[PDB]
Amino acid sequence: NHFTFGDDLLGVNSEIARKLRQFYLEIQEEALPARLLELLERLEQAERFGLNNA
């Protein structure tokens, strides 16, 4: 893993780390919810048309 260095640093909690990584991977929806999509869209608008940048 590119997690191997981090795992060695966590000692006896290395398998806790690994199972947590598996847990989050398996329960998280791969798509962003509508609200975060909308916010990205506003961020793009703020950037393009907003009064706080040029």
Binding site: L10, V12, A17, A46
Partner: protein, 240 residues
């Protein structure tokens, strides 16, 4: 745009938020708050080492400004300790990057991370019974268990001794050798105990020294159904 630069980090950031807050709806509310503050003033995005670091830096900044650093799954850790642990354990940052994200110098981050690991182990420290008749094996197990901060309530050498010790001491974890003396009454002992209460058991014994040269030193046994055995065989062959 900053928006296209930030978007590919959001799946990882949402995972981090979820893991730190304990829930997706709370993790998402914090990610939303970060995006809201950027929409209101885009100039707050840091001019940092890289976009991934700057995104997490901003998230942790906003998070720390709105979250008392007191404990309530890692909710028994302080929020800062759980951030330090998760940044390494789950998020894949190295120590230098994690410390930069948390605005800590190297020594403070190391301390925070080490304390988080200690606090995890202390949180799960418990009373442990060992069922093992061979004293060298039993002591090898006892030392491993004590090094985790557990208390060994006793070492039972027979089935009868194990059942009585179980009721007298109420261990919350059993490490059991299936084999005792010339028989397999270790598994029966565990079975007797489990009709009383549902407690974690790990079946363990030593790897025969006669086979070693100088390697594995323990054998751990687990119950399987036929589907699991077939899956294990296939997996073992696929990755050979």
């Amino acid at each position: 745009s900053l928006s296209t630069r930030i978007a590919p980090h959001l799946p990882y950031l949402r995972r981090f938020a979820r893991s730190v807050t304990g829930s997706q709806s709370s993790g998402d509310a914090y990610v939303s708050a970060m995006l809201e503050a950027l929409v209101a003033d885009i100039s707050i995005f840091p001019r940092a080492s890289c976009d991934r670091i700057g995104t997490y830096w901003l998230f942790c900044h906003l998070f720390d400004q709105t979250t008392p650093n007191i404990p309530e799954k890692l909710s028994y850790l302080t929020p800062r300790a759980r951030q330090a642990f998760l940044l390494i354990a789950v998020e894949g940052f190295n120590e230098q990057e994690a410390s930069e994200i948390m605005n800590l110098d190297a020594r403070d981050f190391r301390k925070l991370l080490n304390q988080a690991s200690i606090d995890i182990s202390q949180q799960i420290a418990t009373q442990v019974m060992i069922i093992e008749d061979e004293p060298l094996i039993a002591m090898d197990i006892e030392q491993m268990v004590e090094s985790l901060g557990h208390q060994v309530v006793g070492i039972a050498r027979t089935r009868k001794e194990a059942v009585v010790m179980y009721h007298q001491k109420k261990p919350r974890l059993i490490l059991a050798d299936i084999q005792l003396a010339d028989n397999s009454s270790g598994i029966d002992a565990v079975n007797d105990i489990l009709q009383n209460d549902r407690i974690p058991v790990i079946f363990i014994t030593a790897f025969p020294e006669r086979l070693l040269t100088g390697e594995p030193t323990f054998l751990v046994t687990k119950p399987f159904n036929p589907d699991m055995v077939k899956a294990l065989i296939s997996q073992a062959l696929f990755f050979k």
